[PDB]
């Protein structure tokens, strides 16, 4: 490979081959936050990682996650595997920069934007030659690295699915961060949006072109005695008995305002103000109905 | 080989143990490895914090203390550290008026700095980033995405450090050293390559009377080599340089704190012309003697006077080294007044240390 | 196995071992109408299917995005192991139900509701002998089936990694719909709750904890003379000139009933009539504010 | 060939024009070559003069300023200046409470400044003198007759420089002098040979990994050539060296002014002792990256500890150099606390500058 050739352009300059340190670990209290700064990576990768190896067990091999700077967040698949990579110094927040290991998939997919495999020889460090490991970048909402998929095992051992297995997960994990945080959003907008109608002064009920409850909001709730969850979606006149006021604006389609108005609801009488408002569309017409506490 | 050491794996404790021992007015951690002032946390104003690979000493430690940097962070040999080091040395020097992380344009450097600002914000740090690319020589370097950044850094450390000093903000702060990278000019020549101890060899070997123009601090190739023909074409083709590649574009990117994301900036560079002030740093990259920086210093004066530049101020050593190499960087920071007022505040750091 | 026995059970009733009939396909009209049903799924799938290949090639094998009732939707790999098992009928269009082909991966794997590999002798039908397919199912935003992602392979060249591969890729491409189709309703949600404010009868602003507006509408835009989205996330103290009651009641979180006051907007006093309400979230305090019509 | 040079005769005259043009508080005399402050003379002090060859450049011209030397004299590259220089250096000085000439302990350096005393004598001047002889490494070497002058001539006249500035009279700094001379200590070893620039050639060659045991400023020969161990191992024989080499019964000479002539006095030198409180220098021979000596600082402290030396002070890095060679030298100062009260007090020069 051409990348391999300045992967060792970079390195020699640096280190030699037959050299190996214990390579950095994060210790205890600062891998906290380095862990915790990934929640959403972390539980979309292990749930991604669990069932790869639910389906692989059993094989030798091991599974990491690894975050922007080659840090090995968690590792998961083949105990044994996972203990000589651990008796290489491979940990819990063991740094795999190039600079720390040499020449490796680790940390090369990240260095070159893409999946990237790397075995035997091909690593610049002489104690990974028995190893294959494969890796795979992702990228954040914005376009920023943000993590690694690495797959490590006995170099004899390596598949050709092994590349393109860290590559469907890494691309599962990194389209469901993206497409988790959009929802992330739209759901905050919600919230607030709801909130806004939370806080009106009037009672506020909203109903489909089909007569079904859409909204409803506590004030509305209390006034019209409905229980504000058991009541969406259900059809509005199973809800409550409702007014020749409000039944012939309703057909007619034509707002009312301020109209006086007395709502049945489950047998009570319940006296109101009320303004209605047709709200037009192609699939129908729905309705606001706001009522005013006197 | 000619290299002062012990074991290949403990040059960097030994050294640093020895900085500790000479330097009491600086604490050394361990577990991880990093430098502050033994007087941080400073309450009351901005922290300063830098790091980068060792293997350019003074640069960074040497530069501990008031007037200047807060704490420093060592990697290995010619290896950026890795952001735990980084966020926990900047833990260490917490101010309660933000932490300024001045940090050289390196991949690495980029990368593991870049980290260590989001790990701090996620912890509730105001925390904002300059970044120094001076090198006029290479776009995209072995370690580089766009220009490299070297010796400028120590003038902009210092001049930053100064304002830090006085009280200004975090904002403040980082918009003048900003200011200050766009106004620096810097490049290198070798005549022989450093050799980094773990590597045993050479970093790269040049032929007899061959030099690298343009050479980096981690012994990157230069613009080519070219045979060195005397020490006047030499000063006088980097200067041309200087001016030939003044200007330029690029896209940088700092970290707003307010928004807790990487706004990207563009901006341009002016080529230093007619008329300018300017503060010269003639450098020694780690084996130059320094009866020939003068030399150096002299035509580099004859150079300015022609270019119409009037240098005010200037510094000649080893101030941004790279281990043993020979040769020397040029540095040209324009300047105005309250620029050289910065210049002339005190500074009591091991290698910097004027003032009252 | 249980399951492979089962499903010989099921073919022993029908079919010969030896005898092969090349499985029904669907003509090129109608099949346009079978892809066009399954554009959400296939398109994330594709491009699964474009990646996983890209980083596996060369290797004799065939990938396949199936539909509910196994009809091939879209094929790729390698050219000649596409050419081969095309001999047999696995074409666009193909149906891949267990009692024409016999028991195989394409089938099983819908049928167990998992992930499944059948090689060699495991599938009924001797002509599939010298294949390995893996397939996996893929559900639906309220759990139908809905696909099946696979991968053939010559029998001896199958990897541990073949399996989880296609798992990988289901995973992507089912998750995303989930999520893809949580987001299409929560943002319906969102114009519903939208639709409602903007019919509203006072004008209504709402800004943040850091002081930006999120939300105003058509008739506080009239009132306070604001252009609709261009006011969108900026801040308040800025969008116009705030009535000294106003920012005393922000800076202390005290309500506002009916409050006559005077905004500045743009060289020009507006006097209307306020509600202030405070929306304290784990965050900080938001506010609606309400313009009412006199 | 790898200097940064020109024609290799305009060396000294670029670095020094350069030297000039660094220094504005420095003044360069033409016809003939001196340097002195450019304040010259001061009234009311006695004038501190010294000199010799350049080459270990800070030394002599680096050390020019306030608390320190009121003008030195360099030679061509390694050789003493002649008379007619020290001469008028010494009278360009005069501030009239004397001038007092610092002398390294080399034939050449020994012969011309002494021609240069009395010339300066019989023109009615005041004017006495100290001889620095710390180097314990070989005894009457290839330049020198007896013990080499080396990097606690530094020292010294920082030391002195302070006495003369304060407003100690002539004989009060003479014996500040010469007292100070027999309590430093030096040793100095190479790992690759300085070249001067006019010979073209290195001036001695070293096979591989070994280092010159006690080798000189001008590239003697020293005690032997060995295997270079480790920096470890190193640092121990030197240390040990010092120590052993400590006691020195020997005579020096001084100008009595009084009765016009050279007076014998026969001097000793204790051993550094358990005990003792130093001043320690590691200084870089030329090339020596900056890194390495704090690797050697790093075990100093540990020997010195070891045989209850308590290091006061120390200064780390290229103080007392040899062109470009590959070594360093270690000076070990016995001090009371008048000598540190000396030691804080202010300079003010391009090498040196501590103080209010």
Chains 1, 3 share one sequence.
Not at chain 1, 48 to 60: H, K, N
Not at chain 1, 242 to 269: M, N, R
Request: charged fraction near 20%; charge should be negative.
């Amino acid at each position: 490979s051409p990348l391999i050739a300045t992967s060792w352009e970079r390195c020699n300059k640096l280190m030699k081959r037959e050299t190996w340190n214990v390579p950095h670990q994060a210790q205890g209290v600062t891998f906290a936050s380095i862990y915790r700064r990934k929640k959403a990576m972390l539980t979309l990768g292990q749930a991604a990682l669990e069932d790869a190896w639910e389906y692989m067990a059993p094989r030798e091999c091991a599974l990491f996650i690894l975050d922007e700077t080659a840090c090995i967040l968690s590792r998961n698949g083949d105990p044994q595997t996972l203990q000589q990579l651990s008796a290489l110094g491979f940990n819990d927040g063991t740094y795999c920069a190039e600079g720390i290991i040499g020449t490796c998939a680790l940390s090369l997919a990240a260095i070159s934007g893409q999946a990237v495999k790397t075995m035997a020889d091909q690593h610049f460090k002489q104690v990974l030659w028995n190893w294959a490991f494969c890796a795979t970048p992702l990228f954040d909402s914005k376009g920023r690295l943000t993590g690694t998929i690495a797959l490590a095992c006995p170099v004899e051992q390596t598949t050709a699915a092994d590349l393109p297995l860290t590559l469907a997960i890494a691309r599962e994990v990194g389209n469901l961060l993206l497409t988790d945080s959009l929802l992330a959003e739209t759901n905050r907008h919600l919230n607030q949006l709801n909130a806004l109608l939370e806080s009106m002064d009037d009672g506020v009920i909203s109903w489909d072109e089909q007569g079904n409850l859409q909204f409803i909001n506590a004030q509305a709730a209390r006034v019209l005695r409905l229980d504000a969850t058991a009541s969406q979606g259900r059809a509005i006149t199973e809800l409550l008995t409702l007014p020749a006021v409000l039944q012939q604006a309703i057909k007619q389609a034509h707002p009312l305002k301020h109209v006086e108005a007395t709502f049945e609801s489950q047998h009570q009488f319940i006296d109101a103000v009320i303004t209605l408002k047709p709200i037009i569309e192609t699939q129908g017409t729905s309705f606001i109905l706001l009522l005013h506490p006197v | 080989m000619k290299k002062l050491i012990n074991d290949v794996q403990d040059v960097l404790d030994e050294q640093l143990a020895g900085l500790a021992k000479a330097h009491p007015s600086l604490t050394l951690h361990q577990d991880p490895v990093y430098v502050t002032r033994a007087d941080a946390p400073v309450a009351g104003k901005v922290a300063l914090l830098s790091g980068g690979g060792s293997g350019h000493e003074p640069m960074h430690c040497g530069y501990i203390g008031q007037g200047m940097l807060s704490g420093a962070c060592p990697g290995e040999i010619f290896l950026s550290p890795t952001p735990d080091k980084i966020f926990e040395c900047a833990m260490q020097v917490d101010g309660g008026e933000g932490v300024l992380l001045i940090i050289k344009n390196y991949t690495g450097d980029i990368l593991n700095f870049e980290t260590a600002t989001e790990l701090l914000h996620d912890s509730g740090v105001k925390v904002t980033t300059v970044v120094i690319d001076d090198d006029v020589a290479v776009k995209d370097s072995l370690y580089t995405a766009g220009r490299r950044g070297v010796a400028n850094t120590v003038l902009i450390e210092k001049l930053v450090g100064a304002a830090a000093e006085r009280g200004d903000s975090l904002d403040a702060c980082a918009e003048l050293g900003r200011k200050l990278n766009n106004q620096g000019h810097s490049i290198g020549i070798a005549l022989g390559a450093c050799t980094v101890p773990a590597a045993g060899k050479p970093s790269f070997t040049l032929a007899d009377n061959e030099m690298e123009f343009g050479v980096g601090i981690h012994g990157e190739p230069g613009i080519d080599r070219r045979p060195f023909s005397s020490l006047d074409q030499t000063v006088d083709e980097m200067f041309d340089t200087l001016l030939v590649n003044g200007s330029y574009h690029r896209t940088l990117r700092f970290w707003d704190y307010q928004q807790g994301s990487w706004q990207e900036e563009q901006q341009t560079k002016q080529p230093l012309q007619s008329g300018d002030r300017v503060i010269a740093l003639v450098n020694n990259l780690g084996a130059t003697p320094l009866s020939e920086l003068y030399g150096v210093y002299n035509r580099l004066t004859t150079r300015c006077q022609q270019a119409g530049l009037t240098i005010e101020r200037n510094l000649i050593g080893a101030y941004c080294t790279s281990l043993d190499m020979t040769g020397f960087s040029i540095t040209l920071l324009k300047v105005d007044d309250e620029t050289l007022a910065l210049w002339d505040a005190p500074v009591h750091t091991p290698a910097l240390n004027w003032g009252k």
